[PDB]
Amino acid sequence: VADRGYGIALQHGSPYRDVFSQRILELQQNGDMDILKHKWWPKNGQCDLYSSVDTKQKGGALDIKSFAGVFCILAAGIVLSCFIAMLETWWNKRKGSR
Amino acid sequence: SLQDLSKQTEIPYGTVLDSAVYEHVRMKGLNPFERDSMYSQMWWMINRS
C-alpha cells in the first residue's frame, strides 16, 4: 500500500524548501541513502523473519498432552468410583450385609 | 521449480564462493529495484555467515 511516505516538514514559504529537496534527490540517486537503510534494516537476519512455515514438522504423532482429555475422563471415572466405594464403605454398615 | 528451491525448508543450497553465480544471486537479492521474495530468500540462505 505504497506511495504514501515520510518527509521533512518546513514552514510555509521557507527559503530552504527547495534546497533540502534538491539534496535529498542527490542522496536518493548517489546511493548514499541506501547505505543508511541497509545499516538500520539489515537483512543479515539472526533468524528468518519471513518463512512462516516451521521447518521440522509436517504432521506428527499423537502424545499424552494432546490425548490427555481421555486420561482426564478416566481419572473422573476413577474418582467417581472412589466416591461410590466410600459411600458403600459407610452404608454397608447400615446394610449389615454384602 | 526454483520457486520451490528458494523457499523449501528441508534442503540447504549454495554455489561456488565469490563466483559470477554467487554475484548474480547477490545482484538479484540485494537489488534496489528487483525486490522478489524469490531472489531474496535465495540470498538469505546463500549468504549465511
PDB file of N, CA and C in Angstrom, chain A:
ATOM      1  N   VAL A   1       0.859  -1.181   0.000  1.00  0.00           N
ATOM      2  CA  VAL A   1       0.000   0.000   0.000  1.00  0.00           C
ATOM      3  C   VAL A   1       0.898   1.235   0.000  1.00  0.00           C
ATOM      4  N   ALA A   2       1.659   1.399  -1.079  1.00  0.00           N
ATOM      5  CA  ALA A   2       2.819   2.279  -1.121  1.00  0.00           C
ATOM      6  C   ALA A   2       2.420   3.718  -1.463  1.00  0.00           C
ATOM      7  N   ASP A   3       3.394   4.478  -1.968  1.00  0.00           N
ATOM      8  CA  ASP A   3       3.316   5.855  -2.451  1.00  0.00           C
ATOM      9  C   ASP A   3       2.965   6.892  -1.389  1.00  0.00           C
ATOM     10  N   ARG A   4       2.336   6.496  -0.286  1.00  0.00           N
ATOM     11  CA  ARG A   4       2.432   7.296   0.927  1.00  0.00           C
ATOM     12  C   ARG A   4       3.882   7.339   1.398  1.00  0.00           C
ATOM     13  N   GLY A   5       4.267   8.431   2.051  1.00  0.00           N
ATOM     14  CA  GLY A   5       5.635   8.463   2.534  1.00  0.00           C
ATOM     15  C   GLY A   5       5.904   9.575   3.522  1.00  0.00           C
ATOM     16  N   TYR A   6       7.057   9.447   4.176  1.00  0.00           N
ATOM     17  CA  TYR A   6       7.531  10.368   5.197  1.00  0.00           C
ATOM     18  C   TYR A   6       8.383  11.458   4.561  1.00  0.00           C
ATOM     19  N   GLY A   7       8.387  12.638   5.177  1.00  0.00           N
ATOM     20  CA  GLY A   7       9.270  13.683   4.698  1.00  0.00           C
ATOM     21  C   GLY A   7       9.437  14.812   5.687  1.00  0.00           C
ATOM     22  N   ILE A   8      10.521  15.565   5.491  1.00  0.00           N
ATOM     23  CA  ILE A   8      10.796  16.739   6.310  1.00  0.00           C
ATOM     24  C   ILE A   8       9.725  17.793   6.074  1.00  0.00           C
ATOM     25  N   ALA A   9       9.200  18.362   7.155  1.00  0.00           N
ATOM     26  CA  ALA A   9       8.258  19.466   7.050  1.00  0.00           C
ATOM     27  C   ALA A   9       8.962  20.791   7.320  1.00  0.00           C
ATOM     28  N   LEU A  10       8.486  21.843   6.653  1.00  0.00           N
ATOM     29  CA  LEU A  10       9.011  23.190   6.839  1.00  0.00           C
ATOM     30  C   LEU A  10       7.869  24.196   6.827  1.00  0.00           C
ATOM     31  N   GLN A  11       8.146  25.376   7.378  1.00  0.00           N
ATOM     32  CA  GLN A  11       7.177  26.464   7.377  1.00  0.00           C
ATOM     33  C   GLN A  11       6.807  26.864   5.951  1.00  0.00           C
ATOM     34  N   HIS A  12       5.610  27.431   5.807  1.00  0.00           N
ATOM     35  CA  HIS A  12       5.169  27.962   4.523  1.00  0.00           C
ATOM     36  C   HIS A  12       6.123  29.035   4.012  1.00  0.00           C
ATOM     37  N   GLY A  13       6.594  28.860   2.779  1.00  0.00           N
ATOM     38  CA  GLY A  13       7.464  29.831   2.148  1.00  0.00           C
ATOM     39  C   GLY A  13       8.896  29.838   2.629  1.00  0.00           C
ATOM     40  N   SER A  14       9.325  28.812   3.354  1.00  0.00           N
ATOM     41  CA  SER A  14      10.692  28.774   3.854  1.00  0.00           C
ATOM     42  C   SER A  14      11.679  28.729   2.691  1.00  0.00           C
ATOM     43  N   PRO A  15      12.747  29.531   2.723  1.00  0.00           N
ATOM     44  CA  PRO A  15      13.691  29.547   1.595  1.00  0.00           C
ATOM     45  C   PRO A  15      14.477  28.258   1.440  1.00  0.00           C
ATOM     46  N   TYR A  16      14.495  27.400   2.458  1.00  0.00           N
ATOM     47  CA  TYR A  16      15.205  26.130   2.406  1.00  0.00           C
ATOM     48  C   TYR A  16      14.429  25.037   1.681  1.00  0.00           C
ATOM     49  N   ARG A  17      13.135  25.249   1.423  1.00  0.00           N
ATOM     50  CA  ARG A  17      12.250  24.168   0.993  1.00  0.00           C
ATOM     51  C   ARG A  17      12.784  23.441  -0.235  1.00  0.00           C
ATOM     52  N   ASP A  18      13.283  24.185  -1.223  1.00  0.00           N
ATOM     53  CA  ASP A  18      13.839  23.557  -2.417  1.00  0.00           C
ATOM     54  C   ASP A  18      15.251  23.030  -2.196  1.00  0.00           C
ATOM     55  N   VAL A  19      15.985  23.594  -1.238  1.00  0.00           N
ATOM     56  CA  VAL A  19      17.382  23.219  -1.030  1.00  0.00           C
ATOM     57  C   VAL A  19      17.485  21.804  -0.468  1.00  0.00           C
ATOM     58  N   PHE A  20      16.725  21.521   0.591  1.00  0.00           N
ATOM     59  CA  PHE A  20      16.703  20.171   1.138  1.00  0.00           C
ATOM     60  C   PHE A  20      16.141  19.165   0.141  1.00  0.00           C
ATOM     61  N   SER A  21      15.099  19.534  -0.607  1.00  0.00           N
ATOM     62  CA  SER A  21      14.587  18.624  -1.630  1.00  0.00           C
ATOM     63  C   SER A  21      15.648  18.298  -2.679  1.00  0.00           C
ATOM     64  N   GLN A  22      16.385  19.318  -3.131  1.00  0.00           N
ATOM     65  CA  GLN A  22      17.493  19.108  -4.057  1.00  0.00           C
ATOM     66  C   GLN A  22      18.520  18.144  -3.486  1.00  0.00           C
ATOM     67  N   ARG A  23      18.887  18.324  -2.217  1.00  0.00           N
ATOM     68  CA  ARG A  23      19.918  17.459  -1.653  1.00  0.00           C
ATOM     69  C   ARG A  23      19.390  16.043  -1.441  1.00  0.00           C
ATOM     70  N   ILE A  24      18.130  15.921  -1.020  1.00  0.00           N
ATOM     71  CA  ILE A  24      17.521  14.613  -0.810  1.00  0.00           C
ATOM     72  C   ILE A  24      17.477  13.821  -2.109  1.00  0.00           C
ATOM     73  N   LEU A  25      17.234  14.494  -3.240  1.00  0.00           N
ATOM     74  CA  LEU A  25      17.264  13.761  -4.506  1.00  0.00           C
ATOM     75  C   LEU A  25      18.661  13.227  -4.788  1.00  0.00           C
ATOM     76  N   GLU A  26      19.686  14.022  -4.479  1.00  0.00           N
ATOM     77  CA  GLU A  26      21.054  13.601  -4.748  1.00  0.00           C
ATOM     78  C   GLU A  26      21.419  12.400  -3.886  1.00  0.00           C
ATOM     79  N   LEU A  27      21.047  12.447  -2.605  1.00  0.00           N
ATOM     80  CA  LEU A  27      21.248  11.296  -1.728  1.00  0.00           C
ATOM     81  C   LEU A  27      20.498  10.070  -2.237  1.00  0.00           C
ATOM     82  N   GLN A  28      19.261  10.255  -2.712  1.00  0.00           N
ATOM     83  CA  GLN A  28      18.484   9.137  -3.233  1.00  0.00           C
ATOM     84  C   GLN A  28      19.100   8.541  -4.488  1.00  0.00           C
ATOM     85  N   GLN A  29      19.888   9.318  -5.228  1.00  0.00           N
ATOM     86  CA  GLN A  29      20.407   8.867  -6.513  1.00  0.00           C
ATOM     87  C   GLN A  29      21.876   8.472  -6.462  1.00  0.00           C
ATOM     88  N   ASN A  30      22.661   9.078  -5.568  1.00  0.00           N
ATOM     89  CA  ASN A  30      24.029   8.617  -5.342  1.00  0.00           C
ATOM     90  C   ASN A  30      24.081   7.185  -4.817  1.00  0.00           C
ATOM     91  N   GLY A  31      23.070   6.754  -4.061  1.00  0.00           N
ATOM     92  CA  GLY A  31      23.164   5.550  -3.261  1.00  0.00           C
ATOM     93  C   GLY A  31      23.525   5.778  -1.807  1.00  0.00           C
ATOM     94  N   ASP A  32      23.888   7.009  -1.442  1.00  0.00           N
ATOM     95  CA  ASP A  32      24.192   7.344  -0.054  1.00  0.00           C
ATOM     96  C   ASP A  32      23.025   7.042   0.880  1.00  0.00           C
ATOM     97  N   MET A  33      21.790   7.174   0.390  1.00  0.00           N
ATOM     98  CA  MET A  33      20.625   6.823   1.197  1.00  0.00           C
ATOM     99  C   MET A  33      20.499   5.316   1.400  1.00  0.00           C
ATOM    100  N   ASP A  34      20.851   4.514   0.392  1.00  0.00           N
ATOM    101  CA  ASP A  34      20.686   3.068   0.519  1.00  0.00           C
ATOM    102  C   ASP A  34      21.569   2.490   1.622  1.00  0.00           C
ATOM    103  N   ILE A  35      22.745   3.083   1.840  1.00  0.00           N
ATOM    104  CA  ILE A  35      23.647   2.588   2.875  1.00  0.00           C
ATOM    105  C   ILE A  35      22.987   2.692   4.242  1.00  0.00           C
ATOM    106  N   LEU A  36      22.434   3.868   4.561  1.00  0.00           N
ATOM    107  CA  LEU A  36      21.807   4.051   5.865  1.00  0.00           C
ATOM    108  C   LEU A  36      20.678   3.049   6.074  1.00  0.00           C
ATOM    109  N   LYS A  37      19.908   2.773   5.017  1.00  0.00           N
ATOM    110  CA  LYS A  37      18.784   1.854   5.156  1.00  0.00           C
ATOM    111  C   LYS A  37      19.270   0.435   5.402  1.00  0.00           C
ATOM    112  N   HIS A  38      20.369   0.044   4.753  1.00  0.00           N
ATOM    113  CA  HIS A  38      20.909  -1.290   4.993  1.00  0.00           C
ATOM    114  C   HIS A  38      21.511  -1.392   6.390  1.00  0.00           C
ATOM    115  N   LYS A  39      22.120  -0.304   6.861  1.00  0.00           N
ATOM    116  CA  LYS A  39      22.560  -0.205   8.249  1.00  0.00           C
ATOM    117  C   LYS A  39      21.415  -0.438   9.229  1.00  0.00           C
ATOM    118  N   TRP A  40      20.290   0.248   9.028  1.00  0.00           N
ATOM    119  CA  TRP A  40      19.222   0.240  10.022  1.00  0.00           C
ATOM    120  C   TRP A  40      18.206  -0.882   9.845  1.00  0.00           C
ATOM    121  N   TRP A  41      17.943  -1.336   8.621  1.00  0.00           N
ATOM    122  CA  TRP A  41      17.121  -2.523   8.387  1.00  0.00           C
ATOM    123  C   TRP A  41      17.949  -3.635   7.747  1.00  0.00           C
ATOM    124  N   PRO A  42      18.923  -4.188   8.473  1.00  0.00           N
ATOM    125  CA  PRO A  42      19.812  -5.185   7.867  1.00  0.00           C
ATOM    126  C   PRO A  42      19.082  -6.493   7.606  1.00  0.00           C
ATOM    127  N   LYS A  43      19.444  -7.143   6.502  1.00  0.00           N
ATOM    128  CA  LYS A  43      18.928  -8.458   6.154  1.00  0.00           C
ATOM    129  C   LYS A  43      19.868  -9.585   6.564  1.00  0.00           C
ATOM    130  N   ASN A  44      20.927  -9.276   7.313  1.00  0.00           N
ATOM    131  CA  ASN A  44      21.751 -10.300   7.948  1.00  0.00           C
ATOM    132  C   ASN A  44      21.046 -10.926   9.146  1.00  0.00           C
ATOM    133  N   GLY A  45      19.837 -11.440   8.926  1.00  0.00           N
ATOM    134  CA  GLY A  45      18.971 -11.891   9.998  1.00  0.00           C
ATOM    135  C   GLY A  45      19.548 -13.003  10.849  1.00  0.00           C
ATOM    136  N   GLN A  46      19.640 -12.758  12.158  1.00  0.00           N
ATOM    137  CA  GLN A  46      19.969 -13.816  13.108  1.00  0.00           C
ATOM    138  C   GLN A  46      18.889 -14.888  13.182  1.00  0.00           C
ATOM    139  N   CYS A  47      17.672 -14.583  12.741  1.00  0.00           N
ATOM    140  CA  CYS A  47      16.681 -15.600  12.427  1.00  0.00           C
ATOM    141  C   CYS A  47      15.956 -15.224  11.142  1.00  0.00           C
ATOM    142  N   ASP A  48      15.378 -16.235  10.493  1.00  0.00           N
ATOM    143  CA  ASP A  48      14.474 -15.996   9.375  1.00  0.00           C
ATOM    144  C   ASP A  48      13.159 -15.420   9.878  1.00  0.00           C
ATOM    145  N   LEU A  49      12.845 -14.211   9.427  1.00  0.00           N
ATOM    146  CA  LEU A  49      11.682 -13.468   9.879  1.00  0.00           C
ATOM    147  C   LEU A  49      10.467 -13.699   8.991  1.00  0.00           C
ATOM    148  N   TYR A  50      10.613 -14.477   7.928  1.00  0.00           N
ATOM    149  CA  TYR A  50       9.699 -14.403   6.795  1.00  0.00           C
ATOM    150  C   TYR A  50       9.069 -15.736   6.418  1.00  0.00           C
ATOM    151  N   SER A  51       9.812 -16.838   6.512  1.00  0.00           N
ATOM    152  CA  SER A  51       9.243 -18.169   6.300  1.00  0.00           C
ATOM    153  C   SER A  51       8.389 -18.585   7.492  1.00  0.00           C
ATOM    154  N   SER A  52       7.072 -18.409   7.356  1.00  0.00           N
ATOM    155  CA  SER A  52       6.115 -18.705   8.414  1.00  0.00           C
ATOM    156  C   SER A  52       5.941 -20.201   8.653  1.00  0.00           C
ATOM    157  N   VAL A  53       6.460 -21.046   7.766  1.00  0.00           N
ATOM    158  CA  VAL A  53       6.309 -22.495   7.866  1.00  0.00           C
ATOM    159  C   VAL A  53       7.484 -23.033   8.675  1.00  0.00           C
ATOM    160  N   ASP A  54       7.223 -23.359   9.940  1.00  0.00           N
ATOM    161  CA  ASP A  54       8.224 -24.008  10.776  1.00  0.00           C
ATOM    162  C   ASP A  54       8.637 -25.350  10.182  1.00  0.00           C
ATOM    163  N   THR A  55       9.950 -25.581  10.131  1.00  0.00           N
ATOM    164  CA  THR A  55      10.532 -26.459   9.120  1.00  0.00           C
ATOM    165  C   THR A  55      10.330 -27.936   9.444  1.00  0.00           C
ATOM    166  N   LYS A  56      10.496 -28.317  10.713  1.00  0.00           N
ATOM    167  CA  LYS A  56      10.732 -29.720  11.043  1.00  0.00           C
ATOM    168  C   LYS A  56       9.479 -30.575  10.887  1.00  0.00           C
ATOM    169  N   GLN A  57       8.311 -30.045  11.239  1.00  0.00           N
ATOM    170  CA  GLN A  57       7.118 -30.863  11.418  1.00  0.00           C
ATOM    171  C   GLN A  57       6.109 -30.597  10.310  1.00  0.00           C
ATOM    172  N   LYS A  58       5.637 -31.682   9.675  1.00  0.00           N
ATOM    173  CA  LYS A  58       4.578 -31.645   8.672  1.00  0.00           C
ATOM    174  C   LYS A  58       3.606 -32.791   8.979  1.00  0.00           C
ATOM    175  N   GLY A  59       2.845 -32.641  10.054  1.00  0.00           N
ATOM    176  CA  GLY A  59       2.215 -33.795  10.678  1.00  0.00           C
ATOM    177  C   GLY A  59       3.106 -34.449  11.715  1.00  0.00           C
ATOM    178  N   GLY A  60       2.466 -35.057  12.713  1.00  0.00           N
ATOM    179  CA  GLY A  60       3.195 -35.650  13.817  1.00  0.00           C
ATOM    180  C   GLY A  60       2.357 -36.523  14.729  1.00  0.00           C
ATOM    181  N   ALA A  61       3.004 -37.495  15.371  1.00  0.00           N
ATOM    182  CA  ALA A  61       2.316 -38.490  16.179  1.00  0.00           C
ATOM    183  C   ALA A  61       1.555 -37.836  17.332  1.00  0.00           C
ATOM    184  N   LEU A  62       0.525 -38.535  17.799  1.00  0.00           N
ATOM    185  CA  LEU A  62      -0.210 -38.121  18.986  1.00  0.00           C
ATOM    186  C   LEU A  62       0.632 -38.322  20.242  1.00  0.00           C
ATOM    187  N   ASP A  63       0.337 -37.523  21.269  1.00  0.00           N
ATOM    188  CA  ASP A  63       1.102 -37.542  22.507  1.00  0.00           C
ATOM    189  C   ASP A  63       0.167 -37.417  23.704  1.00  0.00           C
ATOM    190  N   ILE A  64       0.726 -37.718  24.880  1.00  0.00           N
ATOM    191  CA  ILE A  64      -0.024 -37.725  26.137  1.00  0.00           C
ATOM    192  C   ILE A  64      -0.768 -36.412  26.350  1.00  0.00           C
ATOM    193  N   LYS A  65      -0.147 -35.290  25.987  1.00  0.00           N
ATOM    194  CA  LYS A  65      -0.767 -33.990  26.233  1.00  0.00           C
ATOM    195  C   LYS A  65      -1.961 -33.745  25.315  1.00  0.00           C
ATOM    196  N   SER A  66      -1.837 -34.076  24.030  1.00  0.00           N
ATOM    197  CA  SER A  66      -2.983 -33.966  23.132  1.00  0.00           C
ATOM    198  C   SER A  66      -4.039 -35.027  23.425  1.00  0.00           C
ATOM    199  N   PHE A  67      -3.629 -36.177  23.958  1.00  0.00           N
ATOM    200  CA  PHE A  67      -4.556 -37.232  24.350  1.00  0.00           C
ATOM    201  C   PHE A  67      -5.150 -37.021  25.740  1.00  0.00           C
ATOM    202  N   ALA A  68      -4.603 -36.082  26.523  1.00  0.00           N
ATOM    203  CA  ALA A  68      -4.801 -36.062  27.973  1.00  0.00           C
ATOM    204  C   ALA A  68      -6.271 -36.018  28.383  1.00  0.00           C
ATOM    205  N   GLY A  69      -7.140 -35.430  27.556  1.00  0.00           N
ATOM    206  CA  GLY A  69      -8.559 -35.400  27.884  1.00  0.00           C
ATOM    207  C   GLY A  69      -9.163 -36.764  28.153  1.00  0.00           C
ATOM    208  N   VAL A  70      -8.689 -37.794  27.454  1.00  0.00           N
ATOM    209  CA  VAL A  70      -9.193 -39.141  27.689  1.00  0.00           C
ATOM    210  C   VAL A  70      -8.701 -39.667  29.031  1.00  0.00           C
ATOM    211  N   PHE A  71      -7.427 -39.430  29.346  1.00  0.00           N
ATOM    212  CA  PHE A  71      -6.918 -39.724  30.681  1.00  0.00           C
ATOM    213  C   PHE A  71      -7.678 -38.959  31.758  1.00  0.00           C
ATOM    214  N   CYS A  72      -8.085 -37.722  31.472  1.00  0.00           N
ATOM    215  CA  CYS A  72      -8.866 -36.955  32.442  1.00  0.00           C
ATOM    216  C   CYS A  72     -10.274 -37.517  32.626  1.00  0.00           C
ATOM    217  N   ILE A  73     -10.886 -38.017  31.553  1.00  0.00           N
ATOM    218  CA  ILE A  73     -12.162 -38.721  31.678  1.00  0.00           C
ATOM    219  C   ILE A  73     -12.008 -40.010  32.478  1.00  0.00           C
ATOM    220  N   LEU A  74     -10.945 -40.769  32.218  1.00  0.00           N
ATOM    221  CA  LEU A  74     -10.658 -41.953  33.024  1.00  0.00           C
ATOM    222  C   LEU A  74     -10.439 -41.605  34.493  1.00  0.00           C
ATOM    223  N   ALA A  75      -9.696 -40.533  34.771  1.00  0.00           N
ATOM    224  CA  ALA A  75      -9.493 -40.088  36.147  1.00  0.00           C
ATOM    225  C   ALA A  75     -10.796 -39.665  36.820  1.00  0.00           C
ATOM    226  N   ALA A  76     -11.686 -38.996  36.084  1.00  0.00           N
ATOM    227  CA  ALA A  76     -13.019 -38.699  36.609  1.00  0.00           C
ATOM    228  C   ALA A  76     -13.812 -39.967  36.914  1.00  0.00           C
ATOM    229  N   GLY A  77     -13.704 -40.976  36.051  1.00  0.00           N
ATOM    230  CA  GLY A  77     -14.294 -42.274  36.354  1.00  0.00           C
ATOM    231  C   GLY A  77     -13.722 -42.911  37.607  1.00  0.00           C
ATOM    232  N   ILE A  78     -12.397 -42.883  37.737  1.00  0.00           N
ATOM    233  CA  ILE A  78     -11.722 -43.378  38.936  1.00  0.00           C
ATOM    234  C   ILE A  78     -12.249 -42.675  40.183  1.00  0.00           C
ATOM    235  N   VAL A  79     -12.202 -41.344  40.193  1.00  0.00           N
ATOM    236  CA  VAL A  79     -12.605 -40.578  41.371  1.00  0.00           C
ATOM    237  C   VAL A  79     -14.074 -40.815  41.712  1.00  0.00           C
ATOM    238  N   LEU A  80     -14.939 -40.910  40.697  1.00  0.00           N
ATOM    239  CA  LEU A  80     -16.340 -41.229  40.961  1.00  0.00           C
ATOM    240  C   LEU A  80     -16.506 -42.629  41.542  1.00  0.00           C
ATOM    241  N   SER A  81     -15.751 -43.606  41.034  1.00  0.00           N
ATOM    242  CA  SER A  81     -15.776 -44.941  41.623  1.00  0.00           C
ATOM    243  C   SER A  81     -15.260 -44.946  43.056  1.00  0.00           C
ATOM    244  N   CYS A  82     -14.272 -44.105  43.363  1.00  0.00           N
ATOM    245  CA  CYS A  82     -13.814 -43.958  44.744  1.00  0.00           C
ATOM    246  C   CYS A  82     -14.912 -43.387  45.633  1.00  0.00           C
ATOM    247  N   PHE A  83     -15.567 -42.322  45.175  1.00  0.00           N
ATOM    248  CA  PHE A  83     -16.663 -41.715  45.929  1.00  0.00           C
ATOM    249  C   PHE A  83     -17.784 -42.718  46.196  1.00  0.00           C
ATOM    250  N   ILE A  84     -18.145 -43.500  45.177  1.00  0.00           N
ATOM    251  CA  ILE A  84     -19.121 -44.579  45.338  1.00  0.00           C
ATOM    252  C   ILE A  84     -18.636 -45.627  46.336  1.00  0.00           C
ATOM    253  N   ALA A  85     -17.385 -46.073  46.208  1.00  0.00           N
ATOM    254  CA  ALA A  85     -16.859 -47.083  47.123  1.00  0.00           C
ATOM    255  C   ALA A  85     -16.783 -46.590  48.565  1.00  0.00           C
ATOM    256  N   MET A  86     -16.527 -45.299  48.776  1.00  0.00           N
ATOM    257  CA  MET A  86     -16.527 -44.740  50.129  1.00  0.00           C
ATOM    258  C   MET A  86     -17.938 -44.615  50.698  1.00  0.00           C
ATOM    259  N   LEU A  87     -18.900 -44.211  49.865  1.00  0.00           N
ATOM    260  CA  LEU A  87     -20.289 -44.251  50.307  1.00  0.00           C
ATOM    261  C   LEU A  87     -20.728 -45.669  50.641  1.00  0.00           C
ATOM    262  N   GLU A  88     -20.379 -46.643  49.798  1.00  0.00           N
ATOM    263  CA  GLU A  88     -20.636 -48.044  50.122  1.00  0.00           C
ATOM    264  C   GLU A  88     -19.961 -48.459  51.427  1.00  0.00           C
ATOM    265  N   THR A  89     -18.711 -48.040  51.630  1.00  0.00           N
ATOM    266  CA  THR A  89     -17.968 -48.384  52.841  1.00  0.00           C
ATOM    267  C   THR A  89     -18.662 -47.885  54.102  1.00  0.00           C
ATOM    268  N   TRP A  90     -19.294 -46.716  54.034  1.00  0.00           N
ATOM    269  CA  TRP A  90     -20.148 -46.300  55.149  1.00  0.00           C
ATOM    270  C   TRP A  90     -21.480 -47.052  55.187  1.00  0.00           C
ATOM    271  N   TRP A  91     -22.207 -47.067  54.069  1.00  0.00           N
ATOM    272  CA  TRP A  91     -23.586 -47.552  54.025  1.00  0.00           C
ATOM    273  C   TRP A  91     -23.710 -49.046  54.326  1.00  0.00           C
ATOM    274  N   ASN A  92     -22.715 -49.854  53.954  1.00  0.00           N
ATOM    275  CA  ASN A  92     -22.753 -51.290  54.221  1.00  0.00           C
ATOM    276  C   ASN A  92     -22.757 -51.618  55.709  1.00  0.00           C
ATOM    277  N   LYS A  93     -22.387 -50.666  56.566  1.00  0.00           N
ATOM    278  CA  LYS A  93     -22.620 -50.834  57.997  1.00  0.00           C
ATOM    279  C   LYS A  93     -24.112 -50.831  58.306  1.00  0.00           C
ATOM    280  N   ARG A  94     -24.849 -49.877  57.736  1.00  0.00           N
ATOM    281  CA  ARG A  94     -26.301 -49.871  57.892  1.00  0.00           C
ATOM    282  C   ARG A  94     -26.935 -51.090  57.231  1.00  0.00           C
ATOM    283  N   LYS A  95     -26.420 -51.503  56.070  1.00  0.00           N
ATOM    284  CA  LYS A  95     -26.895 -52.742  55.460  1.00  0.00           C
ATOM    285  C   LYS A  95     -26.575 -53.959  56.317  1.00  0.00           C
ATOM    286  N   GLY A  96     -25.478 -53.913  57.072  1.00  0.00           N
ATOM    287  CA  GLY A  96     -25.084 -55.050  57.881  1.00  0.00           C
ATOM    288  C   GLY A  96     -24.781 -56.307  57.097  1.00  0.00           C
ATOM    289  N   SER A  97     -24.521 -56.186  55.798  1.00  0.00           N
ATOM    290  CA  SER A  97     -24.530 -57.331  54.897  1.00  0.00           C
ATOM    291  C   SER A  97     -23.815 -56.946  53.611  1.00  0.00           C
ATOM    292  N   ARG A  98     -23.477 -57.960  52.820  1.00  0.00           N
ATOM    293  CA  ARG A  98     -22.979 -57.742  51.465  1.00  0.00           C
ATOM    294  C   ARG A  98     -24.120 -57.402  50.511  1.00  0.00           C
TER     295      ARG A  98
END
